[PDB]
């Protein structure tokens, strides 16, 4: 069918939308933009087309294999009270007279409506269910991207999605996909996995495969196959009936409605803003790709999947032959409706493989031993931190990034230094902040950062010191490019923060001592001190813990 | 959405379409025409429109109750062997190099292609499945109907439809609509049920509701709802998959390709020529009508549904209040996408209510006792009868009409006397013949008719004798209109046929003795001597 | 025993080998390639391996039956003069100071040497006879093939083989194998056999069986048994004594000597370039398959064998039951050391069965009567055709293909038109040409094709006109893939050649009249224009008539 059809009504904004940035961090303010509903039209062009999908014997085998694992999963029905407790406090309110705050409180009004929505789900497996369609606001750096289209149903239905399916998507993918299921690895765990599966090959080749607007390429067929996988589980028969109802009334497709209530058209592909999107996209991506591997006769593949993001490490057969089999892979995926964005290429050096906008690099600890850590190009993190420090938002990428990339040269020198300067100047070190980790919202005290980092990365995160050349150049140019002070300047700033932190004692002094030992010259001795976080992807799924 | 979209390509025939008749039976040959593909555009016009559909609590309540019943129903997957055996010997061949004969014979080629269609049905629940669109050649009398459009898929698909849904459509409607499922009634049992439910009311009113081109009014929503009722059954897991997939790729709509292989357009409404049409149409009618009854506050409603055909008998609230309530019933049925053709009218006389082109009337048996029988206007039967005698057709509507209308003045005196005459004059009494009964093709030996008619109608079918005045006139009027000899001539022809038959002894002598006892003058004292009326299968490509 | 063992010395070329085309016929010149010695190593990997062979009662029953049939056969020794006459004029020279030209001229130096090779064969039944190993230069279209490994003995030995065994391989296979011996059929007779035996089954099923590099799977045992089948015949005493010597000293194996005189290794399987290779392979293949049929319990098997190529046609026992008996069949062939390449599949459509790279299809003649004929995918003949026009070969596969496939849509419109146009351009219509029919080399005058075709295929061949949808589409997509112009262009090109041919009168007129009556619109009433070619197979046996 067609991924989308449009009525003509605009995708409309909920309020203002600031396209630009109103400085101690970065001087080239004109390189940072937010996407807006103004670029919506362009996105609608890039994301709408017909979908011709040709399956083959490889697709069916993998699927059979996947169904066999899915059949050993038992999963439970979440109560109204449990599914309420999972809704964020600022989730988008219902059009039926209650908000997320009512839900969280178990108000008998919300709860009665949730009951009613579930009962209709049980009673009617046909009528499409309404979604809202909005354009995302994300900050990026110049050299432009159109806004991405978020699509999601009413809060009533989302609490119902939780009840039917939260336990399935928290549990199944890991079993179905084993070590290929990305969202079970902390950053350190993901480096240990990739590094070890690299050295396990006689002669390793790796590639990341970029799919071209993946949610568009997900066919309604893909989504029923995904349902049959869910249905293999040992389910309660009432969950079984809402999982059917949901996939046919919501996941497969539906109408699109803008913020002003007008009808914008119709979707017959993946909505980003529903509970099954991460799990669904992950499964679908691993299915097609496993098959593409088999089609291209690739040797001893190990895969790692996170939603629409795929990496494959395998046994090379030579540069000529690798490059050719990679094009055979690409056809396989195309035939499966997962065509290429940037066409994929063989890498023979782990460091240069990018997956989940991240890559492996090495550095050394206090004792000199080489340590491998996860990193990324810091442009977007810096840009967003700049945006975050200028315009107050209730979402904190900087903090997520400090947690996720704590060992990195840039997170420690720039991000840690910068914001600990702000919190200290504003007397708000104590105050909890909300950050995203695998699409899930957690409330986090910035003063706990030392424990958190020790726990996810070991003490070495506090003492890494001979970063690789290619990493050091990456960061330096990013800094020159953005107009952020060179690294010598942040060392001097960090010493200032470290000292101010130490004078406050306790948790505050432990941040200074640990997060900033890299800046002192004479190091102190850093000793041990004294998480269902890295288990499953929930991005798009309206989750809070 | 639009029931049909047309590309502009014509609807094409396979062959020569006779339209006019090329005299024993009727003399006014120019009154009888046969529909052809020349009339198709006029039909295309009538059957293509937008459907605005809107449901309410009544609809929804009735659906809940319907599902509850379906849930009590086990149904099983037919094997390829069982499904092959159900295929008519003369069913349109597959475009994949085999025919019904190959199917019927378990040709491993036919069987292996069926296995391949089944497997694709399982992997793929979205790609529309190709149908072929044809204009129907039906025969009529004047005062002019344009051809109906038959729409159907390839034989491979059809066998898969049987594997998946033959047990459901043969079993689900009766459980779900109890006394309303019309196809559980032989013609004698249909009459009994109408008469008793009429007599059981304190003060009865009735109406039949003519839906304007029902097939086109069936929305893609209606067809999915039907699919969801089926799924309430306890079904094998491979059946469940083949049903959804069949409904999404076939039932719900898909491309229309003519006989020359060109795209005519796209369908988003009921297909006339699939296994589920009768069942679907019946359920979908029962659902809309049951709720419409509630919307109109109809007291003590009893209903009879045969696909798109509907009859309601209920308690009267007074003349005035009935008409008003009928108009409410119509309003509802319109919201639900079943606007009327001829708007419904209240009737206080059962013998004036028409349903499945038929009506109850009354006659008296040997003893004097009054018996109720089903009749109709004989115009179309006599038309097709004459057409069947001039041009050899593989279908025999005369036999079916003798079977379904054995007790009628017109079938007894004309159809029996005419064709038993012809059969005699060609030494073909032994030869089995193919006739349709609730859409299914059965082979029947005409010499068996006495045992069959007794079983289906009773001994009294061989001695009904004081037909109502209205009935006698309709028959006689129609005789004058069509130019077919009056009933006194047929009486004479019958004594002659009866004699010849009596002289052959055997089964032939029993036909003589029983089928034409009406004609003798001095009667003989007549003494005594299946699984046919259980479910509907028009469109379904079915044989036993 | 290892099919081959290798010293390490390479397989080397005689002249320098083209691998690429230097366009009237096809634009996509980079899709056409020739195999060269560059790929000898890739082949070497594929064809060298160990043979576990195990036999059973079914194998023995069938061998017994075979020897009984062969015991009814007489066969005579060929004179030297007879044997010399069968030697093609461009057959590789002897390394004992004479050539094929000398052989054909009955020179006393050649004849004296042939007597001495014979005298030594009679006396010595053990000393392995020298062979020469070479890489074959065959043309193909992409979608890569390593070259095949042609291996052959000295010309002296070859003339001796013809003396001993020519009469035997020309006559024995037929008697032994009966209706199964494939090389006894014209292409039209093969078509009639496949068709009639298909229609002779109540409920038919067929399969072809591809054997993983058959020459390599032939064990020394097989080649000895094969020998013992020959010894059943009534044979002159010296025929017997030479047949044993040849089978122990040359057929069983022996050393491999490259074109430079070095030792490449040693062979313990079938040699492609000896006289008994067609007859042996056909027997061995027939013997194993006949037994496997019985192992699998196939009902009413009708078998057709051409060397390593096998098709079986039998009564279907149902689909699951059919699928299973092939697996049983495959297991048996494997025990017997003839494992599969592509595993066999059941087929219920005669036109979808390929055998000898060919399938049956249907057209209609002058009268509209339906008529059966033999065809193939034209990709490979089109490719070899391109090549034979761009570069001068002494082997004209285009002429082979016109004779073999006169009735075909693609042969008539493209091969006929195209080559008759070139012969016309170059004033060479009168000039005899060498072509290979069943591996025997014939010199054929191209103006004789209208008689040759009438005899071999009937007048229907000159007027077939409603080729099946499947056959039309295969020919169409091949034109596109290969870049050859569409059939409308060949119609017009054919009318031109047809006119020019009619103007010359004589036999040139007759070709234009008949061969091209398809391009004319108003046709001529074609009427009758006023062989020992399809008896046995000699592919590999150095044979000329
Ligand atoms: N940073 C970050 C996370 C991530 C964040 C949000 C959604 C999905 C992933 N990222 C690193 C670990 O592997 C996955 C990619
Ligand atoms: N009542 C009833 C049946 C019937 C038969 C077939 C389809 C629907 C109804 N009856 C009317 C028309 O044909 C024969 C007599
Ligand atoms: N059947 C047959 C022959 C054949 C010829 C030569 C060797 C084996 C088989 N066929 C395919 C290849 O050449 C011409 C047509």
Numbering used by the authors:
A (entry chain A), C (entry chain C): 1 to 22, 28 to 148, 154 to 540, 548 to 562
B (entry chain B): 1 to 22, 28 to 148, 154 to 539, 548 to 562
From the paper:
In this study, we presented a ligand-observed MS approach for high-throughput screen of a 384-member fragment library as well as reliable estimation of binding affinity of each fragment hit. This approach was integrated into a FBLD program targeting the RNA polymerase of Hepatitis C virus (HCV), NS5B, which is a particularly attractive target for anti-HCV drug development. Similar to other nucleotide polymerases, the domain distribution of apo HCV NS5B polymerase bears an anatomical resemblance to a right hand with subdomains representing the fingers, thumb and palm. Structural and mechanistic studies of NS5B have indicated the existence of multiple allosteric binding domains including palm I, II and III pockets and thumb I and II sites targeted by reported inhibitors. The proposed discovery pipeline combining our MS-based approach and other biophysical techniques resulted in identification and validation of ten new fragments bound to two distinctive domains of NS5B, among which five were successfully translated to X-ray structures of fragment-bound complexes valuable for structure-based design of potent inhibitors.
To characterize the binding modes of the fragments studied, they were soaked in NS5B crystals to obtain the protein complex X-ray structures. Inspection of the crystal structures indicated that fragments 114, 204, 117, and 328 all bound at the palm I allosteric domain, while fragment 162 bound at the thumb region. Fragment 117 binds at the pocket mainly through van der Waals interactions with Met414, Cys366 and Ser368, whereas fragment 328 forms van der Waals interactions with Tyr415 and Cys366. We assume these weak interactions may result in the lower binding strengths observed for the two fragments. For fragment 328 showing SPR response below the typical threshold for positive binding, its affinity were estimated to be 20 mM by the MS-based analysis, suggesting the latter may be more sensitive in capturing very weak interactions. In this study, four fragment hits and the designed ligands all bound in the palm I pocket, where an overwhelming majority of NS5B inhibitors were also found to bind Specifically, Met414, Cys366 and Tyr448 in the palm domain of NS5B have been documented to be the “hot spots” for binding of high-potency inhibitors3854 and they were also found to be the dominant sites for fragment binding in our study.
